[PDB]
Amino acid sequence: MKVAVLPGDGIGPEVTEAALKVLRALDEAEGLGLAYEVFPFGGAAIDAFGEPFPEPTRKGVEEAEAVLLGSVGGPKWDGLPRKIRPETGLLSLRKSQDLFANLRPAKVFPGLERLSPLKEEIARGVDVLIVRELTGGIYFGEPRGMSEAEAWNTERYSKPEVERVARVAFEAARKRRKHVVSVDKANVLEVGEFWRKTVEEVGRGYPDVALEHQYVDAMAMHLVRSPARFDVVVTGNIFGDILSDLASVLPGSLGLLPSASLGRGTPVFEPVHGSAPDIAGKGIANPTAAILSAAMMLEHAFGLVELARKVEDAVAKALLETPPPDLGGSAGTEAFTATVLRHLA
Amino acid sequence: MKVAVLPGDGIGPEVTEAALKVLRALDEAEGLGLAYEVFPFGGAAIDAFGEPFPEPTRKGVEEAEAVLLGSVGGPKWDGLPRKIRPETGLLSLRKSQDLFANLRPAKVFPGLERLSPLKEEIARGVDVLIVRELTGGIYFGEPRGMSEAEAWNTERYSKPEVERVARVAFEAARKRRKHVVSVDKANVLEVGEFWRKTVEEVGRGYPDVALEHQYVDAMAMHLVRSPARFDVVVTGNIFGDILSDLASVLPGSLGLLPSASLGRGTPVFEPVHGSAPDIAGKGIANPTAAILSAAMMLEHAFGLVELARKVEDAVAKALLETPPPDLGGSAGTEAFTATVLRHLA
């Protein structure tokens, strides 16, 4: 298990080490063959190397089997040239490894339906993985422009772009509850019709995974009224962007959310939360999202699904047993990591 | 007050007459000068006239100041040519009057936060009007196509298209709580940048209305976590379509929702619910949405805002006082219309 660890800025070092402590504890118990090295990234790397993704980190990422990424960014670096800003290093990491599917799970862990914006009965059991196509769609479409008179943009998709994001959805669904919902606008748009029929063709290779299709505006309604009905959801880029953010508010504790970017090169696993510099070094940062990023690494980079499930349960019980400050408790980073390891043992 | 009344199919006759009884009661009390005529539309008109929008109804719509529209459609007509289906008559009515903004309010009436998918604290006081551009955007954009290889569609908008939907938003906000949120994707898309800056320019004519801007994916999050923060929301067509449907589930009793289509010609006010043929003639159809359509007619077709507010309060108290079957009560159509008129008197 070869992991390049890029902790970043602010709370990145604290929460990334918490995740590594869970990984070393499972390595000792299971003989995972964990091997990792820490590389400079983000603002720390701008300060030491003059750029956020220096060639050493490029090489270590390049030579690794997975990247455990912390959080990047800070005021210091906000006024820099676009070329070297923390935010850009993140797009360079993605581009260097041709990562084309962003995976975001939103889950209401047992006993925390209280944090949901939704009523307890609706929030209970929510666990959905939004898979969003990353590289195409209207954000990158040609033609595009603006004049005094008008502005135009093109939602374009080729058979390959749709095929590759659909396969990670199917493969992802196999490791969870075997249900895929692909979301489109096929009843009005050609791109939607095309998406639908390419995913239906792709679906034929995955007989052990159920596939249904929904329109985006209906799916938005569903995600508030009955989100627990879904397992994996896959769609294009801007709808993926809308629907991941919709699903992200359902646990109602955004600090908790992990993310993965999967592709041709080395897969990247990171917390959704930012670098929260204001509390760096205080030992209060909630490690839940970094620990669940490590569990997405085990599931998605190494296929150790049953261990990811085991990490997830450990985190679920620690959230109940010693809630961090964000869940109204007092458990600082280390105290919370400890009760995860206690459940993991 | 000249109203063309197009009751349609299924429950359309029952719920439209309930709305007319509220209008005749306010006419007697206030001397509104109500004048109306009932015209054939939808399936009833296909059966009597051979087409869903026959020239008499075209003329009466044409000569009226507002259309009180019921619900249209039924199995009988589903296998007809597209040319004459109920659903198409609705697009012909819209087109004939060049209606370009669809207005959908989602409101949690006091005491019914219980029906919301959201927790009581979040659902309390929600009242937001989504204004959606109807005539343009990607659903109608050129170029568009599909091949074996790819599919493409164009989200295009001209300065006029944006200007006219922004003005009804501003004008709408003036009659409610004076706050507009325009929603775009201006941080990635040219169409978004263009939209934003045309609405900011338009906004200058409305100094008594506050304007802010939000990205669609952030606005989706907001609509679940703090929807009560908004008054009027305006956006393009597909995002309008996504965001109206998101906002529509927040009261959690879709039967209750009214709609208005506003434009150059005669404005159309209708319930959101369909023709529900299965209970036509039973006298159980909930008239709330048709009665609140009549209140949107008073506010938007005739500017009698204070009377619309007065109708709305009457309906709010009747929902509490004699809940219809959908809110777990026993009040049939007539019984519910009666306690609205009791509060209206």
Side-chain angles (χ1 to χ4, degrees):
Chain A
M1 188 176 276
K2 203 187 182 199
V3 184
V5 186
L6 271 54
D9 311 301
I11 62 176
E14 287 159 294
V15 298
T16 290
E17 182 56 40
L20 283 169
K21 292 182 186 277
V22 171
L23 286 168
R24 293 198 303 268
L26 285 172
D27 185 50
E28 248 62 88
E30 256 76 38
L32 263 26
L34 200 237
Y36 72 79
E37 197 190 317
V38 174
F39 302 86
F41 189 67
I46 286 162
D47 287 0
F49 294 100
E51 65 185 274
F53 190 32
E55 295 292 317
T57 304
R58 302 183 153 271
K59 179 171 180 165
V61 164
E62 182 53 45
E63 270 140 49
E65 290 175 330
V67 169
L68 232 204
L69 207 210
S71 316
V72 147
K76 186 175 173 168
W77 308 293
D78 289 337
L80 292 182
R82 210 148 281 118
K83 202 199 83 70
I84 47 167
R85 281 205 302 277
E87 46 145 72
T88 301
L90 303 160
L91 296 188
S92 303
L93 215 198
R94 178 190 294 165
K95 182 187 169 192
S96 72
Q97 305 308 317
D98 299 293
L99 307 181
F100 53 71
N102 190 234
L103 269 63
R104 296 260 163 129
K107 180 180 174 61
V108 184
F109 288 109
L112 301 174
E113 298 83 6
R114 66 197 186 80
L115 312 170
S116 190
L118 315 175
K119 283 180 163 69
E120 185 161 294
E121 321 81 81
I122 302 171
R124 178 171 285 113
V126 171
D127 184 355
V128 52
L129 171 73
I130 312 302
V131 182
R132 162 198 175 206
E133 192 290 317
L134 274 180
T135 59
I138 187 159
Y139 293 164
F140 307 100
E142 288 312 312
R144 51 197 308 154
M146 191 188 316
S147 58
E148 187 288 338
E150 56 165 3
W152 52 103
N153 272 118
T154 306
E155 173 77 354
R156 190 182 294 278
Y157 269 116
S158 51
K159 199 180 187 199
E161 292 183 285
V162 181
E163 283 173 328
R164 76 219 267 233
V165 75
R167 294 185 188 293
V168 340
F170 279 122
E171 287 295 349
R174 295 215 241 236
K175 306 178 169 62
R176 321 170 106 228
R177 279 152 288 149
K178 324 292 178 161
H179 284 265
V180 180
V181 181
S182 175
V183 171
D184 53 48
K185 196 59 197 145
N187 55 345
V188 187
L189 305 182
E190 291 79 332
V191 192
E193 210 186 299
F194 187 78
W195 182 274
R196 181 165 299 211
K197 63 169 182 182
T198 304
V199 180
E200 191 62 33
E201 191 184 24
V202 170
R204 295 185 296 165
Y206 302 88
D208 54 304
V209 180
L211 173 63
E212 67 164 310
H213 300 275
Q214 292 224 65
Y215 300 120
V216 62
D217 58 289
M219 190 58 221
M221 295 178 85
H222 289 315
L223 279 169
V224 174
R225 289 151 67 86
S226 53
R229 284 174 60 247
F230 307 109
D231 181 32
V232 173
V233 179
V234 65
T235 193
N237 199 345
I238 192 169
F239 290 178
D241 211 5
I242 296 171
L243 297 186
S244 297
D245 284 349
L246 217 203
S248 77
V249 306
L250 270 25
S253 203
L254 278 35
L256 311 199
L257 306 165
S259 170
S261 301
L262 261 41
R264 279 176 29 248
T266 309
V268 174
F269 302 88
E270 61 186 295
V272 172
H273 66 60
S275 63
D278 48 85
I279 57 169
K282 297 186 61 68
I284 52 170
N286 181 187
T288 298
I291 290 175
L292 296 170
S293 296
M296 292 184 80
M297 186 187 79
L298 293 165
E299 179 172 355
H300 294 107
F302 306 107
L304 277 334
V305 181
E306 198 201 281
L307 269 183
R309 297 293 173 267
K310 186 203 183 168
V311 171
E312 275 155 8
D313 296 6
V315 168
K317 299 253 179 47
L319 285 166
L320 261 22
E321 190 200 308
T322 55
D326 297 309
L327 283 72
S330 50
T333 321
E334 203 57 64
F336 184 82
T337 309
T339 140
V340 172
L341 293 174
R342 275 193 265 101
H343 281 279
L344 218 41
Chain B
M1 188 176 276
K2 203 187 182 199
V3 184
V5 186
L6 271 54
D9 311 301
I11 62 176
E14 287 159 294
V15 298
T16 290
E17 182 56 40
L20 283 169
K21 292 182 186 277
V22 171
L23 286 168
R24 293 198 303 268
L26 285 172
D27 185 50
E28 248 62 88
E30 256 76 38
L32 263 26
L34 200 237
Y36 72 79
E37 197 190 317
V38 174
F39 302 86
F41 189 67
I46 286 162
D47 287 0
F49 294 100
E51 65 185 274
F53 190 32
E55 295 292 317
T57 304
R58 302 183 153 271
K59 179 171 180 165
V61 164
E62 182 53 45
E63 270 140 49
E65 290 175 330
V67 169
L68 232 204
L69 207 210
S71 316
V72 147
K76 186 175 173 168
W77 308 293
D78 289 337
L80 292 182
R82 210 148 281 118
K83 202 199 83 70
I84 47 167
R85 281 205 302 277
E87 46 145 72
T88 301
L90 303 160
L91 296 188
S92 303
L93 215 198
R94 178 190 294 165
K95 182 187 169 192
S96 72
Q97 305 308 317
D98 299 293
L99 307 181
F100 53 71
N102 190 234
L103 269 63
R104 296 260 163 129
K107 180 180 174 61
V108 184
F109 288 109
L112 301 174
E113 298 83 6
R114 66 197 186 80
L115 312 170
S116 190
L118 315 175
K119 283 180 163 69
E120 185 161 294
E121 321 81 81
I122 302 171
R124 178 171 285 113
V126 171
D127 184 355
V128 52
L129 171 73
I130 312 302
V131 182
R132 162 198 175 206
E133 192 290 317
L134 274 180
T135 59
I138 187 159
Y139 293 164
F140 307 100
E142 288 312 312
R144 51 197 308 154
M146 191 188 316
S147 58
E148 187 288 338
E150 56 165 3
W152 52 103
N153 272 118
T154 306
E155 173 77 354
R156 190 182 294 278
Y157 270 116
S158 51
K159 199 180 187 199
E161 292 183 285
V162 181
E163 283 173 328
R164 76 219 267 233
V165 75
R167 294 185 188 293
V168 340
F170 279 122
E171 287 295 349
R174 295 215 241 236
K175 306 178 169 62
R176 321 170 106 228
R177 279 152 288 149
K178 324 292 178 161
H179 284 265
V180 180
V181 181
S182 175
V183 171
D184 53 48
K185 196 59 197 145
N187 55 345
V188 187
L189 305 182
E190 291 79 332
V191 192
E193 210 186 299
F194 187 78
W195 182 274
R196 181 165 299 211
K197 63 169 182 182
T198 304
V199 180
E200 191 62 33
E201 191 184 24
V202 170
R204 295 185 296 165
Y206 302 88
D208 54 304
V209 180
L211 173 63
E212 67 164 310
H213 300 275
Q214 292 224 65
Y215 300 120
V216 62
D217 58 289
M219 190 58 221
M221 295 178 85
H222 289 315
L223 279 169
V224 174
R225 289 151 67 86
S226 53
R229 284 174 60 247
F230 307 109
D231 181 32
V232 173
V233 179
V234 65
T235 193
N237 199 345
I238 192 169
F239 290 178
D241 211 5
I242 296 171
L243 297 186
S244 297
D245 284 349
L246 217 203
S248 77
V249 306
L250 270 25
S253 203
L254 278 35
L256 311 199
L257 306 165
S259 170
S261 301
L262 261 41
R264 279 176 29 248
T266 309
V268 174
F269 302 88
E270 61 186 295
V272 172
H273 66 60
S275 63
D278 48 85
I279 57 169
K282 297 186 61 68
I284 52 170
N286 181 187
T288 298
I291 290 175
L292 296 170
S293 296
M296 292 184 80
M297 186 187 79
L298 293 165
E299 179 172 355
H300 294 107
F302 306 107
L304 277 334
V305 181
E306 198 201 281
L307 269 183
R309 297 293 173 267
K310 186 203 183 168
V311 171
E312 275 155 8
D313 296 6
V315 168
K317 299 253 179 47
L319 285 166
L320 261 22
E321 190 200 308
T322 55
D326 297 309
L327 283 72
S330 50
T333 321
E334 203 57 64
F336 184 82
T337 309
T339 140
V340 172
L341 293 174
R342 275 193 265 101
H343 281 279
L344 218 41

